[PDB]
Amino acid sequence: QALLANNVENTAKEALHQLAYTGREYNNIQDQIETISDLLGHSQSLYDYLREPSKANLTILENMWSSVARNQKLYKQIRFLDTSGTEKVRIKYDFKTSIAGPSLILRDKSAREYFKYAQSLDNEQISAWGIELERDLSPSLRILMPISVNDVRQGYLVLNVDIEYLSSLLNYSPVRDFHIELVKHKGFYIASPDESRLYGDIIPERSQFNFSNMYPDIWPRVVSEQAGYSYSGEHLIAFSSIKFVSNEPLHLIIDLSNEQLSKRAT
Ligand SMILES: [Mg+2]
């Protein structure tokens, strides 16, 4: 188990360095997310609002959270729901135009599953809920944190991290020309140069786009090992798993076909 092919073994090696780097970047972003959650969780404006919910105390909150959105760029939406799950503050940011602002539409959401999940969470504990889409293509990871003042719960931070954004920010290495795809633990893709294979567990006509079923022999290593590669004699597949805000493993993949293994130089 180790020979080989020289040109192809070199490539994998480089592929693995790339996954080491980009993985580390992901770590940072996720730590950024938790950091921001705490600040947001402790922001003054929030406290002031929490005790005295005027429209003057709101306005300052909103203004504040909107500067965070417009400054951090990676949050599609930032929200406080009360202990009863009513959105009291709902900020949206759009990195295409880069305006952050308060919504006027507030909704009860104590129906939705993720809120109940939110429930079963310790004060100040940050976990991630699944991945969501928009229309009907724009996806977002959803992050949750129960918030309390003097171990007395008050409401819930909910974040929507823009995966389309991260993805175009982390997933292509121009020096090395490697696309890093993102594959969830369930086997479905949430990022790829190839758009048609995305979200097979949301879009039923994509359901065959699952790693366990596209690469039956490799999937198992990807699942149980922290990093490595494998050649199936059609594709070389290099992988390394990280933890991203949940502690659901997320698998970063570099995947090259035989044809692509035509690696020259410029
Ligand atoms: Mg880069």
Q: Distance, CA 167 to ligand 1 centroid (Å)?
A: 10
Query: Taking a C-beta distance cutoff of 8 angstroms, is the pair 17, 175 a contact?
Result: no
Q: Distance, CA 250 to ligand 1 centroid (Å)?
A: 18
Q: Distance, CA 169 to ligand 1 centroid (Å)?
A: 6
What SS3 class is residue 239? strand
Q: Distance, CA 21 to ligand 1 centroid (Å)?
A: 9
B/e letters for 219-236, b = 16+ CB within 10 Å, e = fewer, are beebeeeebebbbeeebb
For 106, which DSSP code? Answer: -
Q: Distance, CA 175 to ligand 1 centroid (Å)?
A: 9
Specify the amino acid at residue 120: S
Closest-CA residue to 227 (of 24, 7, 29): 24
Q: Which domains, ranges and CATH numbers included, belong to the chain?
A: 1-43 (1.20.5.170), 44-170 (3.30.450.20), 171-266 (3.30.450.20)
Q: How far apart, in whole angstroms, are the C-alpha atoms of residue 105 and residue 111?
A: 17
Q: Distance, CA 156 to ligand 1 centroid (Å)?
A: 33
Query: Taking a C-beta distance cutoff of 8 angstroms, is the pair 196, 187 a contact?
Result: no
B/e letters for 88-97, b = 16+ CB within 10 Å, e = fewer, are bbbbbbebee
Q: Distance, CA 33 to ligand 1 centroid (Å)?
A: 19
Q: Distance, CA 147 to ligand 1 centroid (Å)?
A: 34
Closest-CA residue to 129 (of 79, 84, 93): 79
For 248, which DSSP code? Answer: S
Query: Residues 6 or more apart from 97 whose CB is under 8 A from it?
Result: none
**Resolution value in angstroms:** 2.6
Query: Residues 6 or more apart from 95 whose CB is under 8 A from it?
Result: 73, 74, 162, 165
Query: What tokens does 109 get?
Result: 């959401």
Query: Taking a C-beta distance cutoff of 8 angstroms, is the pair 73, 94 a contact?
Result: no
Query: Taking a C-beta distance cutoff of 8 angstroms, is the pair 198, 163 a contact?
Result: no
Q: Distance, CA 245 to ligand 1 centroid (Å)?
A: 21
Give all strands (DSSP E) within 65-133, no chain letters.
75-82, 87-94, 99-102, 127-133
Q: Distance, CA 125 to ligand 1 centroid (Å)?
A: 30
Where residue 27 falls (left for φ over 0; alpha for ψ -120 to 50; beta otherwise) is alpha
